[PDB]
Assembly symmetry: none
């Protein structure tokens, strides 16, 4: 199977969350509303495996 091109990153300004300011933050105040928010914002502070992009490239 295959969800997407599944390979190196190819974006830039849109969905972080590499600048772990929320998780490094909320990793101490227990508050998924802040991370649920962060990933609501668009960082996704949580993991770097299951990602979903809206601008596919297979066709572009």
């Amino acid at each position: 199977m295959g969800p997407l091109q599944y390979k190196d990153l190819k974006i830039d300004i849109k969905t972080s969350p590499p600048p772990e300011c929320i998780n490094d933050l909320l990793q101490a105040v227990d508050s998924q509303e802040v991370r649920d928010y962060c990933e609501k914002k668009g960082w996704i502070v949580n993991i770097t495996s299951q990602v979903q992009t809206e601008r596919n490239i297979n066709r572009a």
Copy 2:
């Protein structure tokens, strides 16, 4: 008046919080525990217009 004798403000030190990732974050999930944490961490994310709710509560 102010919170105290607020003076000397032309450096930066390890205390941010200009990178408003917590406040820009927590400004939407209502969670002073994250900012109380952020300023506990050392950013101090907190606008200074006319707030006077005796911050720095006794969390220890």
